[PDB]
Amino acid sequence: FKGLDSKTFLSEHSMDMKFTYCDDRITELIGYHPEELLGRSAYEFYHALDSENMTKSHQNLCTKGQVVSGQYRMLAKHGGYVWLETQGTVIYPQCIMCVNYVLSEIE
């Protein structure tokens, strides 16, 4: 069992969804070092079955300025997927600020 702070991590993205920053809490949760995510699009990490839904959420984020993503799976560093939900906010567009919270263990 993990407390709330431990299951949450912040990320920043350019408008194309490429990571520009990720907080180190992701490492214990999903396996990645922040440095290895930088410059990679978030879209590289979504499960195939969430891809169309996340495209829609990204569209909603860009049109409205904020979004709650809905549940989706992020590819983990060493295989499998973690369920997450993300609150995204556009900073004005300059970048996207995400608060990400894990909903499952790696599966």
Added chain:
Amino acid sequence: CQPTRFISRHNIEGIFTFVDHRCVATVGYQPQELLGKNIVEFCHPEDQQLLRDSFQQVVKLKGQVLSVMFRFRSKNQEWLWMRTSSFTFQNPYSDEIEYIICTNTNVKNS
């Protein structure tokens, strides 16, 4: 040219509870020099009340972004214009107190 910016997390009072290490390039301090201190301690006297009041209101705005411009004292004791975009977060599965997420960008006053 990429704007110089860093992310911070604050409690509702204004205390830094997380600081992204891009702060060093933006304002010259290490994260440890900011953590535990109120953002207002780095704010120009003229802007301090505005900053306090911004932090007080952002928690009432249902998670929308509130922006504020203020002068931030760099590690070299010089006033840098910052545009801080802030919003509240609380994990919806909980009733933990909201905290404030900030993106802090050095901008021009021109």
